[PDB]
Amino acid sequence: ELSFGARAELPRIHPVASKLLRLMQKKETNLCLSADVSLARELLQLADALGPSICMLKTHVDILNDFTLDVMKELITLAKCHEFLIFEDRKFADIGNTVKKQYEGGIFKIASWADLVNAHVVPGSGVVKGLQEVGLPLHRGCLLIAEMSSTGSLATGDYTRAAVRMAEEHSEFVVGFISGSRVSMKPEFLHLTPGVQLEAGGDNLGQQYNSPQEVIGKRGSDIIIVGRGIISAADRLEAAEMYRKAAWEAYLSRLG
Amino acid sequence: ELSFGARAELPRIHPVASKLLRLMQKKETNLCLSADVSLARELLQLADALGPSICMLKTHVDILNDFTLDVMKELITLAKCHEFLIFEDRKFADIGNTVKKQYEGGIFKIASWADLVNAHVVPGSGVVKGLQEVGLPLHRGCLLIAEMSSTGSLATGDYTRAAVRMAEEHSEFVVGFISGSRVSMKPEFLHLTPGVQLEAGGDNLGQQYNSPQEVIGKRGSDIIIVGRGIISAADRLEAAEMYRKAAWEAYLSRLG
Numbered sequence A, B: 001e002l003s004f005g006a007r008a009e010l011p012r013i014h015p016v017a018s019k020l021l022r023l024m025q026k027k028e029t030n031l032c033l034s035a036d037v038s039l040a041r042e043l044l045q046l047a048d049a050l051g052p053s054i055c056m057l058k059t060h061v062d063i064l065n066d067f068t069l070d071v072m073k074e075l076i077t078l079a080k081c082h083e084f085l086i087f088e089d090r091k092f093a094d095i096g097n098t099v100k101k102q103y104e105g106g107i108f109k110i111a112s113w114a115d116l117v118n119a120h121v122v123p124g125s126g127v128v129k130g131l132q133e134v135g136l137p138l139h140r141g142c143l144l145i146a147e148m149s150s151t152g153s154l155a156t157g158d159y160t161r162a163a164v165r166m167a168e169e170h171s172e173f174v175v176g177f178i179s180g181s182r183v184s185m186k187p188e189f190l191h192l193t194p195g196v197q198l199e200a201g202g203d204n205l206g207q208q209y210n211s212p213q214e215v216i217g218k219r220g221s222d223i224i225i226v227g228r229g230i231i232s233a234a235d236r237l238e239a240a241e242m243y244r245k246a247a248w249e250a251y252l253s254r255l256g
């Protein structure tokens, strides 16, 4: 097993994955903040304060009540300053012809500001082909959703294997997975795991939680994605530091 | 087998399904226009001219370069005038806690103007439970994506059966399916089929076409969803009438 810094140099590494792995190693963080807020001011204040603690800030642009492209310009300034990627968790899941337009155009112009997006594999590989026709020219990366944290997820067995094959066949654009575990044996691919809290539990709408030690240490994932475990805490900076230290030590203990 | 008008009266019918089935029968249309345009003015001019020919207008709000809520107000005026439902093809596909926010909030406020939305079943039933928390109080309906038109679709076999079970267990909110065929034997549920053109073919990003006679007549679906077969034609009104007459006669001939 290689360090994040060594994985950043692998021959087949995607440039977006390399940039991410280098700043993970530099900053000792494998934490992705899930910035699940409705106010631009709260999004930007979290990005500024937690920027030094995170490798990535994950957005849902479509729940921002006061979205503008100028908000995303301000988020990019903070991403550059503090060194983290922006990941829009849009979960593209339509035919290729439609997702290309949803990625490039409309009000959000996601491809203009998002380093990473993700896609469901259920429509077949046309979803990746459509996205990559916008994303490749804009030097972007994509994550495929191989496993899901929610109760009743159908992303198991042959479905997960299909996601891994689709990723490994589109490595010019696909840089990794949303998964609960290591699903690819190829170290060029990133594994990002949501459904993470320090305490056991879930929510009222099918979310299930596992700890950073479980998902990074035992299940072999790379990055934890944490929303409410940080966002709902009073001191979001201290909460981010507790999640960062948990995920980082779990990673170190698997390296030996 | 019952007529659309008789299905509108079934004991377990959802009010949104009933409204749709009644206007389908009244207007002799089982055509859904897929209004896949980037300009509000073109969306509204198509809605006005084709309104009499359609039972439903399907949107992708996130590809409208000049979206505002006022555009949606004008679309509702046309939907009420010409009698068609508005279906936002958002393909919700996240955990329940996230999709509730994506449906009610952000800049689109989809639930405020969309009679129907749809969801992927891959996250498990929490996706439906999250949507229904917003949609039930707003008297809305939902379609579950049981089958997809695109090459390499994983929505087959056990996946399709899981979509039907999830629909039949959430009948207070789920009114039918996106499918290529009749997938439920319960006549209360609507079947809407995209991937429809009069001529054989596909696109360059995995779309596959079947004819109205094939999907309504042979495969037993209720409604055809047609985008480019109409939108790319010079005369979109005549194209809509061709598709309407094809789908309507296929329905009548299955009825006998």
Ligand SMILES: O=C(O)c1cc(=O)[nH]c(=O)n1[C@@H]1O[C@H](COP(=O)(O)O)[C@@H](O)[C@H]1O
Pocket: A034, A036, A058, A060, A089, A118, A147, A148, A149, A150, A178, A194, A195, A196, A207, A225, A226, A227, A228, A229, B094, B095, B098
């Ligand atoms: O793609 C995602 O990040 C995602 C995938 C998944 O399997 N489960 C999952 O919870 N998510 C997202 O990750 C975040 C989880 O947030 P919390 O449950 O608050 O920590 C939400 O924004 C979800 O939309």
Ligand SMILES: O=C(O)c1cc(=O)[nH]c(=O)n1[C@@H]1O[C@H](COP(=O)(O)O)[C@@H](O)[C@H]1O
Pocket: A094, A095, A098, B034, B036, B058, B060, B089, B118, B147, B148, B149, B150, B178, B194, B195, B196, B207, B225, B226, B227, B228, B229
């Ligand atoms: O839910 C949908 O309508 C959908 C499901 C599916 O299986 N395939 C599919 O093409 N669609 C949508 O239906 C429309 C098909 O458009 P055309 O290929 O131009 O007729 C697109 O807007 C798609 O996003």
